């Protein structure tokens, strides 16, 4: 009923959208992994009379439900998708997207890692993102590679029309008391990568984490704090 939807409010298999700004939504889904249930976020950005999708809804059936929810709530076709790193909450569902006519994209680093892990593999490679600090335009967004953080390949996404920063899994929500799933992370480099985000996007008004509630720029400093303390 208008609040940001939380893990126990979304049954696994259902998707909800949340309006972030004019022409910007997040998508929220839930998934079971190793016997626990987690929420995760992605982004939808209006691209004229088409939509750009950022990240799957964490699984094939969730991603089919995402496409149905978009049709119900927005009614414009999803034509392109970008996955912001190689984990299943970002690429799981790419095969569903690819069969629904969506062109799927990721960095070459993400594509390699997805392939090596046995995860679904986006079709198209995004060049120009291999060195930290790199940025490229992709429709109505800018894609930015901040350096290694949650994963070596993680990308963040900025919507300049709305000053929306989608941090993906390199950014944690304010209530986080832990650095999440760090199996593929670089805890030593993560603060430096967050500092790069802070320097590059000082006018961000909304910051969206990969999991949990959006907020403001404080999510960036909070993330650095939880990562340093996790390492400590
Ligand atoms: C799909 C992804 O696969 C990762 C993976 C890696 C390696 C292997 C081995 N090949 C297998 C799987 C995955 C699965 C399950 C949970 C997560 C979480 C997660 C997010 C927030 C919290 C709350 S908190 C207060 O700590 O911030 C917590 Cl506990 C966890 C994240 C995330 O941090 O991005 N990613 C997750
Ligand atoms: Zn991840
Ligand atoms: Zn994640």
UniProtKB/TrEMBL annotation:
Reactions that this protein is recorded to catalyse: a beta-lactam + H2O = a substituted beta-amino acid
Primary residence: periplasm
Annotated positions of the Cysteine sulfinic acid (-SO2H) modification: 169
Keywords assigned: Antibiotic resistance, Hydrolase, Metal-binding, Periplasm, Plasmid, Signal, Zinc
Protein localization: Periplasm
Binding-site residues for Zn(2+) 4, renumbered to this chain: 125, 127
Cofactor field: Zn(2+)
E.C. numbers: 3.5.2.6
Domain Metallo-beta-lactamase residues, every copy: 39-211
Parts forming coiled coils: none
Function, as annotated: Class B beta-lactamase which confers resistance to the beta-lactam antibiotics, including penicillins, cephalosporins and carbapenems. Acts via hydrolysis of the beta-lactam ring. Has penicillin-, cephalosporin- and carbapenem-hydrolyzing activities.
Protein name: beta-lactamase
Organism: Pseudomonas aeruginosa
């Amino acid at each position: 009923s208008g609040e940001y939807p939380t893990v126990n409010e979304i049954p696994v298999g259902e998707v909800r959208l949340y309006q972030i700004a004019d022409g910007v939504w997040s998508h929220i889904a839930t998934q079971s992994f190793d016997g626990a249930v987690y929420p995760s976020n992605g982004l939808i950005v209006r691209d004229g009379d088409e939509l750009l999708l950022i990240d799957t809804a964490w699984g094939a059936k969730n991603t089919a439900a995402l496409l149905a929810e978009i049709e119900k709530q927005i009614g414009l076709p999803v034509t392109r998708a970008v996955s912001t790193h190689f984990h299943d909450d970002r690429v799981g569902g790419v095969d569903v997207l690819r069969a629904a006519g969506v062109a799927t994209y990721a960095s070459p680093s993400t594509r390699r890692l997805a392939e090596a892990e046995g995860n679904e593999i986006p079709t198209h490679s995004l060049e120009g993102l291999s060195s930290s600090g790199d940025a490229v335009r992709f429709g109505p967004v800018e894609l930015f590679y901040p350096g290694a953080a949650h994963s070596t390949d993680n990308l963040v996404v900025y919507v300049p029309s709305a000053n929306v920063l989608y941090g993906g899994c390199a950014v944690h929500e304010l209530s986080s008391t832990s650095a999440g799933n760090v199996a593929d992370a670089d805890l030593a480099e993560w603060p430096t990568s967050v500092e790069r985000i802070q320097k590059h996007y000082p006018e961000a008004e909304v910051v969206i984490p990969g999991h949990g509630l959006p907020g403001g720029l404080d999510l960036l400093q909070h993330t650095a704090n939880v990562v340093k303390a996790h390492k400590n």
